[PDB]
């Protein structure tokens, strides 16, 4: 992280597509370097077709400039999460804020 | 463009004697340079006797030198040849510059 930001960091980070941002708050049911699964919050859940949220992570893949890109989880088991919060740090990011 | 003698280095960047930078108007902000080698003997002699850096010291446009200590050495020298009104070890007498150096050291 940059010690002295201008506060516009989280906006840029989340608005970009690199990081995996939760869509409906929930709880980490199981984490792995490759994927994540969230038991959805009771209320956010739709009446029919409950299911549970799941994410897969793009591992090392060449960028347009020959720079590898991959994502790393930034949470542990049993961690409650909220809608729109970051889950997987992408390149040059730290806890869902830009860090070059 | 100027000739030089080479000195090998375990790097991947062409070192350059700083004084000539003014002549090349070359900043170190990522400017690149190109290297050529003279093959035949006459080329080598031309280089040594005409294009060696030590032979080009006055701009052809005018007799003014072209190896002016550019920006940093000048600061050092100016700072050196100053004088505080009352500094440590004032008013004494010395028997030559060597004593001055020893005293300062």
């Amino acid at each position: 992280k940059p010690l002295v930001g201008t506060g516009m960091e989280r906006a840029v980070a989340v608005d970009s597509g690199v990081t995996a941002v939760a869509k409906r708050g929930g709880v980490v049911q199981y984490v792995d370097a490759s994927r994540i699964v969230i038991k959805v919050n009771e209320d956010e859940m739709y009446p029919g077709e409950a299911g549970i949220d799941i994410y897969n992570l793009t591992k090392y893949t060449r960028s347009n400039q020959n720079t590898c890109i991959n994502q790393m989880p930034c949470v542990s088991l049993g961690e409650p999460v909220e809608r729109g919060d970051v889950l997987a740090d992408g390149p040059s990011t730290d806890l869902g804020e830009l860090a070059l | 463009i100027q000739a030089f003698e080479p000195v090998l280095i375990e790097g991947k960047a062409i070192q350059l004697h700083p004084l000539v930078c003014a002549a090349y108007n070359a900043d170190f902000d990522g400017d690149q340079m190109a290297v050529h080698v003279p093959l035949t003997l006459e080329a080598q002699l031309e280089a040594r006797a005409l294009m060696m850096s030590t032979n080009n010291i006055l701009s052809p446009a005018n007799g003014e030198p072209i190896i002016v200590p550019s920006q940093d050495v000048v600061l050092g020298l100016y700072y050196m040849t100053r004088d505080c009104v009352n500094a440590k070890g004032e008013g004494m007498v010395l028997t030559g510059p060597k004593e001055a150096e020893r005293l300062y050291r």
Partner: protein
């Protein structure tokens, strides 16, 4: 006159587990800076370390892959392992082994240590297993070296992973000079050396090592 008081090691204040202090006294005028700078350079320069060199994990082929069950990349594991701290008594090279199963963190304590290899930071974390039926086994290689050695410049199967070597215990060295309280004399100096190592070295041993190193190096100039 024409004689100089020989300094002696007076005290070693082990102010913390790693932070330590040493005192040298007496010292003739002007020598404090000389010796302090010299010893600082020597200590920061060369000291025998025992950093880890190679790794061999069971079910992986290259550091850029992942392993199921573990929630960190192989590169992260290697990076964390690089900062390990340990001492070895007799041998110049040893092979440690780590096996672990179940869920939770993996401290350094989880190593099947022998009586000659001694960890200094048992609680050093490595990785977090996130599945009960997910285990990891690995063989670690520890060598005895000095200074820095990148993996690029050294000198076999496809399972060996190579890290960079940083054989150096010390991290920060400072010192001060100050007047002593000798029976009757002024301008008599006393040196205090503050050090902070990673904890795998005896300060006194380090000082004696540096001093003998310096003396042995200096002895060339005499009797040219």
């Amino acid at each position: 006159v024409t004689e100089f008081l020989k300094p002696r090691l007076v005290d070693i204040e082990q102010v913390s587990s790693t932070h330590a202090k040493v005192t040298l006294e007496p010292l003739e005028r002007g020598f404090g800076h000389t010796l302090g700078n010299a010893l600082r350079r020597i200590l920061l320069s060369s000291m025998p370390g025992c950093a880890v060199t190679e790794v061999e994990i069971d079910g992986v082929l290259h550091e850029y892959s992942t392993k199921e069950g573990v929630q960190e990349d192989i590169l992260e594991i290697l990076l964390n392992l690089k900062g390990l701290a340990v001492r070895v008594q007799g041998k110049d090279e040893v092979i440690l082994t780590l096996n672990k199963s179940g869920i939770g963190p993996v401290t350094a304590a989880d190593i099947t240590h022998d009586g000659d290899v001694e960890i200094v930071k048992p609680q050093h974390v490595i990785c977090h297993l996130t599945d009960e039926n997910a285990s990891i086994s690995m063989r670690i290689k520890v060598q005895r070296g000095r200074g820095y050695v990148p993996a690029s410049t050294r000198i076999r199967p496809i399972g060996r992973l190579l890290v960079d070597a940083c054989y150096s215990p010390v991290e920060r060295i400072a010192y001060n000079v100050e007047a002593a309280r000798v029976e009757q004399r002024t301008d008599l100096d006393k040196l205090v050396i503050e050090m902070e190592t990673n904890g795998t070295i005896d300060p006194e041993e380090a000082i004696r090592r540096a001093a003998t190193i310096l003396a042995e190096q200096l002895e060339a100039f005499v009797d040219l």
